[model samples]
Target: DPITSESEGIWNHFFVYPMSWLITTVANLLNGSYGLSIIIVTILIRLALLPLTLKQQKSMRAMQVIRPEMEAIQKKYKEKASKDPKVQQEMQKELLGLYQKHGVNPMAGCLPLFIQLPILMAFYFAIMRTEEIRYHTFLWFDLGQPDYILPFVAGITTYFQFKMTMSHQMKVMLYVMPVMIIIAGLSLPSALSLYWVIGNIFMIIQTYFIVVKAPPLEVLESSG
Candidate 1:
């Protein structure tokens, strides 16, 4: 059990510690310090998720291109449209047909959340499991305790993540979600928050090109 730190329980056996260890090993081989090791771990996690993030963005773009189609489906399937179950079923089928044509699943974006949860949880657990960080100071505070700095970083980076992923109607959520996350960040160890913030920062970078090249509101309206 001591293979894990005295306080560490199940997290040392989780997948994230090995990943963090691998990243730390690589960074230490090059830089020889735990501090740089964490930075490298953050970098490697972002790199590993690079392709997934890109794919997620491409899917978002495709959904944007087909938004009107999805809206139409929603309108047809409105909850009060009818008490008839078959009508809803038919509408669902039509929606699926439209998505199939465009090769976009309106809900495919949700898949990334499910895929990321385990890694994220594992990372959080890794931080909770490590006593080194119990008193390890990074920048403004102890890494094992909550701090405003990591939350600020997480909020800013996540804002960009949502900015790229939002629909015009839902674009405001991008800003709102970050604020909400910052508030929630108060509950976790700053180190985990740091990892999250770094992850979002990478996503922001990966998403920037797509957001910049994305067609504007005028194009959407004109097409509609």
Candidate 2:
């Protein structure tokens, strides 16, 4: 309680208070089932971040279209890049110019990721500090304590979420994150792990929509 109590001022006045109110209000409306309410909250967070997700998807699509050219540039640069430091810097400059010429901002994809971390931290603390969430039990275990089954399921879903969204080069993390998640999830509060699961589920669904139904990440083939 020492650390948690010490952070109460910032947590209470900022994240925990608002998050608790929202969770409590939604739980009351959903017949006092905090689990269902938490799911709804997860969906709301996804919805709020929808614009950023869409933008990231769009940027990824653009990047995918330009990958062939980008790879060519890299290969061409690789020969001269080792010749001298100035040559390597010039090659990078050419790559940046090429991306700009194609109307792609390489850094645009990072902003949404930056925006999500604080929101995630807030939820982590909210789940930790909120008494109702601490005392509540959803299907199999106390939300405040660790549960083996839920954490494993969370790790599984995390892998699938990465599988559904990441590129071929990024697939290595597809193998790595699940192990990391399982190890960490085994120790964290179930409520926090539950949040991770729900968030991953939402991303899985969102990826399906974007990858299958929407513009897709391979729209460009030729340019004038």
Candidate 3:
């Protein structure tokens, strides 16, 4: 469909149009409740992203477990660092090698979340702009309009979801993020907030299974 302007065509082409169809197709099967469709789509998206999520979690675990070694390297180099510039350079090189030896990139851990953000925003636009979803009502709210209850649900689900996966180093975001979700949800269409809640719930379940229960192989090796 002609869903975007010249500048936005690429985004619409790649994400919006495709996801809108998927959402609509699912909605039609579920008696045309856009809300239910969004939920299903969110779940499917999460499932589709399982491999990446697993990798991201594994990478994060590797980074976390390597901190002891990293700290050791830092301390080992501390005395030499003050004595000679060449020693400091050697320490930096050794640290980089240590990171590579573990097959860990400190920055690799955030890849999954970073990748999903754009897709999520694209779905938000699709749900908002799609005419078919505008008239539908789901449970207690109109999918096209903002509602206080849905935003709180979004915030709450987000909190619990993030709580499962968030690290101790990021405790501040654990509290601040839910408030952000609530504020953003309250302002956006109910459909988008519903999407966030559904996605969050799916993520929570996935985190329990992958992070809490199974844990990545790298983490197992590190712990052992």
Candidate 4:
């Protein structure tokens, strides 16, 4: 219940708590309240993972830009032309060539998300389990409680953020994710949803920066 000490809640166990502690401490050191501290903590998290995200974003851009080339490779591989050794070699060569040329790996985007999940879950749990964030009000809603106002705003912000970041082909997924998350919110604690909603606000800001201000982290050099 005590936010002051790591002895309380899931933080006492280990694994993720230390990372959270470091972020919180840095935030607290930089700011006075846990409220502002959370904003800073989010930024630090974003900045800390910037390199990985940059690479992943670059890789994804590579994938999108190389869509035509990849389709051509898949056209051959789909027929199970592997009975011939030459075909197998050709397939491998095509796949590798596509990656080499684009500087993207199919696995790169997923890897960073998998890595970020634990930290995200730990922060969610810490916010839910700790009392400090429970009754704490941020502008309008008490972040610890369920405020429809927050959720609605979150949904809108998330939808917008999702729209900006995703390309046309993948845009459906952006629409789907928030819907699923909103449903999940119904069963889980409000505090967790609050965190999610707040997280969406942060995301909207991040996406705006990426889409409008920053150049593509990576680009596809060869397109024909």
Each prediction's total of clashing residue pairs, residues at least 3 apart in sequence or on different chains, is: 0, 0, 0, 0
**Residue-by-residue lDDT tens digits, candidate 4, 113-192:** 69767777777776665655665666765655666555555566667766766665354556776676666665554555
* Tens digits of lDDT, candidate 2, 1-224: 97887777886778767877777889999988888888899889888888778877777667877787899988987766366777878887999887766767788656766876777778777777667777789999888888898889999998998787766536456787788888988888887778889999999988887662233333332222
Clashing pairs in 1: none
C-alpha lDDT values of all predictions: 0.69, 0.78, 0.79, 0.63
TM-score for each candidate, following the candidate numbering? 0.74, 0.81, 0.80, 0.65
With candidate 1 superimposed using the best TM-score fit, by how many Å does residue 134's alpha carbon deviate from the native?
A: 1.5
Candidate 4 error regions (>4 Å): 1-15, 19-32, 75-97, 100-103, 168-172, 186-194, 197-207, 210-224
Comparing 1 with 2 on lDDT, the higher-scoring candidate is: 2
Please report how far candidate 4 places residue 195 from its true position, in Å: 4.0
Clashing pairs in 2: none
Better by TM-score, candidate 4 or 1: 1
> Which pairs in model 4 have colliding backbones?
none
Error of 1 at 118 (Å): 1.2
Best by lDDT: 3
Q: lDDT tens digits, residues 57-163, model 3?
A: 76666676677888998887785535577887788789878777666776775666688788877898888768987778888898898888989998889889867
